[PDB]
Design a protein around this ligand. Structure first.
Ligand SMILES: C[S@@+](CC[C@H](N)C(=O)[O-])C[C@H]1O[C@@H](n2cnc3c(N)ncnc32)[C@H](O)[C@@H]1O
Ligand SMILES: C[S@@+](CC[C@H](N)C(=O)[O-])C[C@H]1O[C@@H](n2cnc3c(N)ncnc32)[C@H](O)[C@@H]1O
Lengths: 340, 342
């Protein structure tokens, strides 16, 4: 009749084999290997690095959850769900579940949540020896993979941010923590007379240059490698913070906003774009954001924030909330000017 | 399926924050703390060992999943779900989720699942320094907590074992690997005429002696400390194996069946009570059993087995599979006898 069984509900929540069965199978590329059709375990185990027995058993669980079909014993075919796990797929989940990549690799922190509760700080260092940014920097290939994954998210959100802000009284925009520059590229091409500056890590900006630095919009952008905890390049009236504040704890997220305020001068405008948490939660939107927030606590030192917490940071960095809007999709867009 | 529906369902499957939030919060005793009613985070944080902000954010994820209530910001209260996580509770799930206890401790092995596909064998040693049995033996407190947690699963299935078998042909049963012996005890007083023996480790059985060795059932039961891989005690005409084979890789599980086949002699019984995996997809619990099988692979060297995986193992010990009937509660029961006859 209805969904009233508290015991069953608890069984849904406590499963930890399924999420790591899932991640592992994506890492070993089984969605790709079965995309064509039914494949028996001997074959799937050979191509990936796997023991046939173990893989049979891991796929059996995931087949009980509808990720794979098993029409006979030890043969596994594709489903609507496995389509979404393929590299092939337009909006693929692969970069977020692949343990080769840095994003899913950070989910190994889940086992250290107790220490995270004791110290109130991140546990990426406890899992891997160094905290997230340090070891993404010491392993460039991991850093490149991080940047490529983030570029997939940015690419979806770009056209919306470009439209979502007013660019009339803006002559030079700085994308601070802008990744490969997917958002800035859109802003500039949408507004032919804008100057741009991509500020990020050196190999990140350089990979961004290769991608679109030759294009019409690329010509009107300086690709400036560096750190946004230091002083920023001068002469930007607008600074753009698209999904960077939630990576950082309160003192560090503050320091970024200070450097952005410093960079834009008085009556300069710092433009923030995040998904913000909302007190009286809701269904799938708020639950997903609360999950993501624990990823921020464990991997990074960060946090998803409400509008009012964002306001407490802006006030301590000589800024004030001007115009809060929202993209027809849920991404909120806040413009901040200077005080006095 | 179609894209968005598939997408929704995948999000449920991929979530690793929730199940560790849940285990963290159970380890800290937050369900006990809110049993009386709403508590502020300040008090929860103070009474757990926790930073308030860290705990708050953990609790609001679990709030959106229905484990706790949050009626105003930063206050958390009990639910039907949290009631089941109290130590207090009769059907309590705390021992399966408390990371200070041995069961949930094993769940940390999930992060090394790729290594387990690489080699095939367990990764408890990779995670903790020793394989599951050896650091359970090296930490007496975990050893008792394991036996207390296994006795709770024994408690809910012992009635079904007694009525599920025919004890008429039996004189002296021996519950091999039987734990504290909740399955033997319910067997010995539901059948007054029988004798008993409980083989497990010495502190496991001496604790079982303290629990019910004084009772009327316990007077007829020899509480023997030992190892079921070595020669079993002499003079039983049946051996009982209640959820003991799924802990062991084929080769160790074989050795256990041989000692059971040897101990009873010809015209004896080896009675096996296990949850068996089905080739199709059962329902429900094939999902749950496939979940458990992955724990058995990662933590222990073990496996959930089909009837025929059992048949092969009993076969190689000179046993055949006789009667195969199933409990209402879903447990398969099989009487094994000597392979070759008359
Ligand atoms: C969430 S990401 C990318 C956000 C970007 N708007 C996007 O969606 O592609 C945050 C960015 O901050 C950058 N970052 C981290 N620490 C930094 C530092 N000290 N200086 C400059 N950039 C940094 C990362 O390299 C990354 O590109
Ligand atoms: C799954 S449990 C037993 C379940 C229990 N009979 C019940 O019905 O709840 C596994 C048993 O194997 C036992 N065990 C582990 N190593 C052993 C050894 N060397 N000798 C005897 N028993 C051992 C454990 O103490 C534990 O009681």
């Amino acid at each position: 009749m209805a969904d009233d069984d508290a015991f069953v509900h608890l069984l849904r929540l406590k499963d930890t084999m399924t999420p790591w069965a899932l991640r592992a199978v994506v890492t070993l590329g089984v969605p790709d290997l079965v995309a064509e059709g039914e494949k028996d375990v001997s074959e799937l185990a050979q191509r990936s690095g796997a023991v046939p027995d173990a893989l049979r058993r891991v796929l059996r669980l995931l087949a009980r959850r509808g990720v794979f079909t098993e029409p006979r014993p030890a043969v596994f075919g594709p489903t609507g769900l496995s389509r979404l796990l393929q590299s092939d797929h337009p909006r693929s989940m692969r970069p977020w579940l692949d343990l080769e990549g840095p994003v899913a690799r950070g989910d190994r922190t889940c086992v250290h949540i107790l220490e995270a509760l004791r110290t109130g700080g991140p546990v990426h260092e406890r899992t891997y020896g160094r905290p997230v940014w340090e070891d993404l920097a010491a392993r460039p290939a991991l850093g490149a993979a991080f940047d490529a994954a983030m570029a997939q998210r940015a690419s979806w959100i770009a056209g919306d941010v470009a439209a979502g802000f007013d660019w009339s009284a803006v002559r030079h925009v700085m994308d601070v923590g802008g990744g490969t520059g997917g958002v800035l590229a859109e802003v500039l091409r949408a507004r032919p007379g804008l100057k741009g500056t991509l500020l990020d890590r050196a190999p990140t900006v350089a990979a961004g240059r290769e991608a679109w630095g030759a294009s019409e919009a690329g010509q009107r952008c300086t690709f400036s490698g560096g750190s946004f905890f230091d002083t920023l390049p001068s002469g930007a009236d607008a600074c753009l913070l698209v999904n960077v504040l939630h990576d950082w704890a309160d003192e560090h997220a503050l320091a970024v906003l200070r450097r952005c305020a410093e960079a834009v001068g008085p009556r300069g405008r710092v433009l923030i774009a995040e998904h913000l948490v909302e007190e009286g939660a809701g269904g799938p939107g708020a639950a997903g954001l609360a999950e993501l927030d624990l990823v921020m606590m464990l991997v990074y030192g960060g946090r998803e924030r409400r509008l009012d917490e964002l306001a407490d940071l802006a006030g301590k960095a000589g800024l004030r909330i001007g115009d809060v809007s929202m993209t027809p999709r849920g991404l909120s867009l806040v413009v901040c000017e200077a005080e006095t």
